[PDB]
Amino acid sequence: SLALNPAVAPIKSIEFIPVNYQSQNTVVVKVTDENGVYGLGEADGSPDAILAYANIETEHKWLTNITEKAIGRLPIEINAIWDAMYDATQWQGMRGLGMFALSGIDMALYDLAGKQLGVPAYQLLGGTNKDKVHPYLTLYPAIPDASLDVAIKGYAPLLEKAKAHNIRAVKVCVPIKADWSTKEVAYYLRELRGILGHDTDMMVDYLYRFTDWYEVARLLNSIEDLELYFAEATLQHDDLSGHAKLVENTRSRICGAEMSTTRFEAEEWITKGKVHLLQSDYNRCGGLTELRRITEMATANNVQVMPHNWKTGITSAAAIHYQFAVGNAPYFEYVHPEFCDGELRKYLVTPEAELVDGGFAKPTAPGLGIDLNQEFLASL
């Protein structure tokens, strides 16, 4: 029989690396094979809690150290390793924090498997027929929570810059500690849309400031003319039935699942929440593997997926590969260096994908196409 690829070597180690910048932070997951080749991923959650979770001692069938079931396995069997890790950690990792850890490892396998096979991550996910992808950029000025005038002035230059770079879509937020009434919020969004223009799609993150679906429906119904792309974090994250109400009583796109984990929670958001779009996060919900299952399910149910993305360059890389091979929507969330502040997001990994005419070209490097910036890490 023909010879097997010697490069697909077993996993030798998995290291969780807490990264704190002096608050911005992350947990880099480095999976190294027996030949010294490694893959990089990252997990959400308090770095110290994640590190502790990653170092627990195995007790029984369902309470196993997360890395244990991955060590020794061939990186190419990402789907099987996912199941192995999940099955062995059900006692404390089926949802919540534990899944963030599993997510980082999953992401790192795509980087490792690709590097071993010398193929970009998106090809391991199925390839693509898109010649380019377009992200929407999440914007937020340096404002303190501020007042209507201050918030607007702060956004203005960011919005003008986005247009100058032909960014196809942007997301603005309603400051959390802002005491604006719902009518003021409507005014706010009308002013921002006025500045931005209608040529560029505009999304809105309400940051969970509401609890009554009726009040939200009134607000969303009154700004229908703004033709906003979607309404994010309108109601509390556990209030799935409330989101269904918004869907049933407004003509806005209703998002959900930003903080969720697994395809199981995603399925409930689809059928019970009736949401138009899911925002399950790369480094929270189960990685690219779970995002693929989630998206194929979503497509069958006429639901778009734009994974939440607000970490470092590691997740931004996965996001581009995701949009090329898995994405089922016109845009996906991306945080760009020239459109945000965050040393960690800017310097942790290299290189940074070049945004051309508001879009990204197909990745050309093996795996996720990234590497750690050692000088930066060593500098603490």
DSSP calls for 56-116: PPP-BTTB--TTTTTTTS-TT-HHHHHHHHHHHTHHHHSSTHHHHHHHHHHHHHHHHHHHH
Q: How many domains does the chain have?
A: 2
- On whether the CB atoms of residues 288 and 125 are closer than 8 A, the answer is yes
Do 158 and 122 share a structural domain? no
* Tokens linked to 237: 């994250």
Instruction: Give the domain CATH number at 238.
Output: 3.20.20.120
CA distances from 97 to 45, 89, 237, 281, 283 (A): 7, 12, 16, 13, 10
Do 217 and 123 share a structural domain? no
- On whether the CB atoms of residues 314 and 105 are closer than 8 A, the answer is no
Using CA atoms, how far apart are residues 302 and 343, in angstroms rounded to an integer? Answer: 38
Using CA atoms, how far apart are residues 55 and 39, in angstroms rounded to an integer? Answer: 19
Cα dihedral 340, 345, 347, 350 sign: negative
At residue 197, φ and ψ (nearest 5 deg) are 95, 170
Do 152 and 119 share a structural domain? no
Select from 369, 367, 370 the least CA-distant residue to 78: 367
Instruction: Give the domain CATH number at 56.
Output: 3.30.390.10
Do 294 and 151 share a structural domain? yes
Do 168 and 148 share a structural domain? yes
- On whether the CB atoms of residues 125 and 326 are closer than 8 A, the answer is yes
Do 237 and 88 share a structural domain? no
Residues contacting residue 51 through CB under 8 Å, at least 6 positions apart:
16, 18, 27
Do 306 and 289 share a structural domain? yes
* Tokens linked to 284: 């929270």
Do 349 and 371 share a structural domain? no
Do 328 and 243 share a structural domain? yes
- On whether the CB atoms of residues 367 and 75 are closer than 8 A, the answer is no
Do 79 and 25 share a structural domain? yes
Residues contacting residue 335 through CB under 8 Å, at least 6 positions apart:
137, 138, 309, 310, 316, 342, 345
Q: Which domain holds residue 37?
A: 1-127+364-380
Using CA atoms, how far apart are residues 331 and 169, in angstroms rounded to an integer? Answer: 8
Select from 66, 145, 73 the least CA-distant residue to 99: 66
Do 151 and 175 share a structural domain? yes
Select from 201, 189, 42, 204 the least CA-distant residue to 135: 201
Using CA atoms, how far apart are residues 256 and 236, in angstroms rounded to an integer? Answer: 10
Select from 261, 280, 268 the least CA-distant residue to 243: 268
* Tokens linked to 311: 């970490």
- Kindly give the interhelix angle for 287-300 and 262-271, rounded to the nearest 10 degrees: 20
Do 277 and 135 share a structural domain? yes
Experiment used for this model: X-ray
Other CB atoms within a 10 A radius of the CB of residue 52 amount to 12
CA distances from 350 to 36, 106, 144, 369, 373 (A): 19, 20, 32, 8, 6
* Tokens linked to 354: 């070049």
* Tokens linked to 12: 């030798």
Cα dihedral 80, 298, 99, 113 sign: positive
Angle at 188 between CA 192 and CA 177, to 5 degrees: 120
